[PDB]
Amino acid sequence: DDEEETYRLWKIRKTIMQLCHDRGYLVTQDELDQTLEEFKAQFGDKPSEGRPRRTDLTVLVAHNDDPTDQMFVFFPEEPKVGIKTIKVYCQRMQEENITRALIVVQQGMTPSAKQSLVDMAPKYILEQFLQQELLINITEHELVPEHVVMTKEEVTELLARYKLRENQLPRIQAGDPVARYFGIKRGQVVKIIRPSETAGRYITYRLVQ
DNA sequence: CAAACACACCAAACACAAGAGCTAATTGACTGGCCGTTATCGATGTATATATCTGACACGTGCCTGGAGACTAGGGAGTAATCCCCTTGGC
Known part of the structure; x- marks a missing residue:
């Protein structure tokens, strides 16, 4: 198909742009949420052996x-x-x-x-x-809470606060779609913020391993 | 062509099947070889019971020797007279 393929490409590009923005790379507020019309007008909307x-x-x-x-x-x-x-x-x-x-x-x-x-x-x-896997941005999903990749300094701060060995923190395998989305790798802690129905908000941590 | 991994399929196992509580009744090893004890069958008697033969005692029959019976023959023992030898007796 032609139109469907163009739609798929635009969705993939939007997903990747949102991903890069989430990681930290600077991106235009324009391209972050560019509609499909300008996408067509930019590339040509003829993916089937054509410009895009x-x-x-x-x-x-x-x-x-x-x-x-x-x-x-x-x-x-x-x-x-x-x-x-x-x-x-x-x-x-x-x-x-x-x-x-x-x-x-x-x-x-x-x-x-x-x-x-x-x-x-x-x-x-x-x-x-x-x-x-890119046609949809999982991080927006209702179930998937908000992740925040932590820096090494604060990871050490946390471990030293709770006197807890990083081996004792929960685990999250690298293969997890959220992990691959954020680009975290082994030996790195991801902060999780969940709305708690009994405490309003609840923050937990998960070490990748 | 040969080797890497991946997938689908086939073939092979593991472990679980709530907490327990009470009562009843069915199973109580068995042929065979062999050793060890003991019961039985057998010989080799000596003791006692019975049968045959020999010896001593008893009752009975017997052969043999000597004794006894009836009868006889014929003569030994034995009356009745006589003589006169001899004894006892006497002065």
């Missing part, structure tokens, strides 16, 4: 406080992305000092690809998202 073709709508955004830190958002055309594509992406990334990135794959990448992805991990952080 993938890999052309990628967006690079720099962090809020560290203008030196950016992250790509690729959109490979291969339904079953291989390793060669990620290989060339990483090579082309290597020219700049960028370290983080985000891959949007049509369909699930082959298992051989995940091995390569993790292999380059310490040097170039890159993670994957299925468009099917």
Whole structure:
């Protein structure tokens, strides 16, 4: 389809922009909530072998406080992305000092690809998202409360306040969709704020592991 | 072509099935070989009971020796007279 594909692309882009904004990267208040009309008028609304073709709508955004830190958002055309594509992406990334990135794959990448992805991990952080997982922004959902990634200093402050070993805090595996959304990694604590029906508000913490 | 992982399927197990409380009744091992005790069958008697034969005592029959009976023959023992030898007796 044409119209549906354009709608899907616009939704994916909006989701990614909201995600980057949540993480901390600075983004236009315009593109954060741009409707679909300007999207059509910008790209062409002819994804079917036309102007709005993938890999052309990628967006690079720099962090809020560290203008030196950016992250790509690729959109490979291969339904079953291989390793060669990620290989060339990483090579082309290597020219700049960028370290983080985000891959949007049509369909699930082959298992051989995940091995390569993790292999380059310490040097170039890159993670994957299925468009099917990006068509909706979970963090807005009624059930999913509000997360706040904590800085190391305050994590130490918390642990020293409650005299509690970080091993004793609750756990949240990295695979969790909220974790992958925020880009948290192992050994890092996420603050959770829930409306408590018996206490108004209740704040808890979860160490990723 | 060979090796990596992933998925679907097939095949194989684990553990659970509320808290308990009371009462009743069915099961009470068994062939066989073998040793160890003891009951039984058998020989090798010596003691007692009974049968055959021999010895001593008893009653009975008997062969043999000597004794006894009737009768006889014929002669031994024995009256009645006589002589006169011899004894007892005498002065």
